[PDB]
Design a protein around this ligand. Structure first.
Ligand SMILES: Nc1ncnc2c1ncn2[C@@H]1O[C@H](COP(=O)(O)OP(=O)(O)O)[C@@H](O)[C@H]1O
Ligand code: ALF
Ligand SMILES: [Mg+2]
Length: 395
């Protein structure tokens, strides 16, 4: 209940972090402002939980109130927001040109760069800006570590029809989700690459049946792995998704290399990272993976989910594992692991390329009763083919 007031000139952003113990309430009291591309409503109170990192930007100028203990709060005057806006502008230009020559295929954009340069944040701003233009782009999440669509260990895609919630991020409206099963692509690089392609193939077939999605195009977020084998992932992602535009954030050498390698038709743009982007340690990142898993089952402060715990007979499910498909015996070592419900009706070669229904968490294993307790988003298992993930979570 301490109060801070901020006057933001045009093209300025208030960056703040909520206290370690404290909620911070933000209210726009004059003008117009947006948080990572989502417009703030005048006088609406936005409660951010402890440790939240937030940036509120304004094009024309704003006055903003914060109520609560903050670790840091300052106004920055020079951001790359204009750059990020012109990227959206050029995408929409491409949409119109292709519309006037047509079903029109929307432009596809790949965001690349090392850890903590703001690829996710920029993907969010671009998705929001497209929605505010009246478009429905497809957001494609290839980061199996820091995943904003599903649990970690997935490659996923979602049609974006609403701007992100300011506090909770995007609504996960019926995502297409593939179970990769690891927090980094180097754990099985060829499987990771096969999922890209199966994802790209699936999306190409789906947009055939939906013109809005088709002209919406794609914003594709990669992980921060740019060196060695990560570089080749970028080239194969570019190719498999047939991208028109590669945005490289804060990596001149990557940009140089990609310019010499990509098809000449590919427009490549190097842009700086924002001064507000925060370096995150392995610990913080591990904690964020845990909170992602937690959110998948329980939702948010704003939007609670109510997941079911029940027992499942080992005679009613087949547990399997990728690394080719192998059938698993119920064992004590599956405890705390995620399992994906495979859309594939049988435990065969189709599992590898099949998207999934969702996940459960194995909370207990009773070997003698031949049962396991699972946490599950629904009352009854949506599939009897359960695919192992190396991601674990103590609840
Ligand atoms: N302009 C900004 N102001 C404050 N925090 C930011 C800003 N841009 C990014 N961040 C934060 O910095 C962190 C890293 O950004 P992110 O987009 O997740 O990096 P990357 O996706 O490249 O790994 C995130 O916690 C994000 O919320
Ligand atoms: F998307 Al990153 F570090 F590159 F979370
Ligand atoms: Mg990211």
């Amino acid at each position: 209940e301490n109060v801070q007031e901020f006057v933001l000139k045009e093209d300025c952003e208030l960056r703040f972090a909520a206290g370690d113990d404290s909620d911070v309430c933000l209210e726009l009291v004059k003008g117009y402002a947006e948080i990572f591309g989502t417009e703030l409503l005048l006088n609406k109170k936005y409660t951010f939980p402890a440790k939240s990192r937030v940036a509120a930007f304004t094009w024309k100028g704003a006055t903003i109130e914060l109520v609560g203990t903050t670790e840091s709060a300052y106004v920055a005057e020079s951001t790359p927001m204009v750059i990020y806006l012109n990227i959206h502008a050029a995408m929409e230009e491409v949409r119109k040109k292709r519309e006037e020559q047509a079903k029109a295929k929307g432009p596809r954009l790949l965001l690349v760069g090392p850890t903590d340069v703001g690829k996710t944040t920029v993907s969010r701003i671009l998705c929001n800006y497209s929605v505010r233009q009246g478009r429905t782009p497809i957001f494609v999440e290839l980061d199996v570590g820091q995943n904003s669509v599903s649990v970690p260990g997935t490659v996923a895609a979602v049609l974006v029809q609403k701007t992100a919630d300011v506090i909770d991020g995007f609504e996960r409206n019926q995502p297409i989700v593939f179970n990769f099963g690891h927090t980094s692509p180097s754990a099985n690089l060829s499987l990771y690459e096969a999922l890209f392609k199966e994802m790209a193939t699936t999306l190409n077939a789906q947009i055939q049946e939906n013109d809005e999605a088709k002209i919406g195009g794609m914003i594709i977020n990669t992980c921060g792995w740019v060196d060695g084998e990560g570089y080749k992932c970028i080239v194969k992602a570019a190719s498999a998704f047939e991208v028109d535009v590669v945005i490289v954030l804060d990596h001149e050498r990557l940009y140089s290399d990609l310019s010499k390698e990509l098809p000449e038709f590919v427009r490549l743009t190097h842009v700086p990272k924002s001064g507000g982007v925060e370096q995150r340690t392995g610990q913080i990142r591990s904690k964020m993976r845990g909170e992602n898993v937690h959110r998948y089952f329980y939702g948010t402060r704003a939007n609670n989910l109510y997941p079911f715990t029940f027992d499942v007979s080992f005679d009613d499910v087949t547990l399997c594992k990728i690394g080719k498909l192998v059938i698993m015996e119920p064992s004590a070592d599956i405890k705390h692991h995620l399992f994906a419900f495979s859309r594939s009706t049988k435990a065969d070669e189709n599992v590898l390329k099949s998207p999934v229904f969702g996940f459960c968490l194995v909370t207990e294993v009773d070997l003698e009763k031949r049962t396991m307790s699972i946490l599950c988003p629904q009352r009854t298992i949506p599939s009897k083919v359960l695919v192992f993930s190396d991601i674990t979570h103590l609840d």
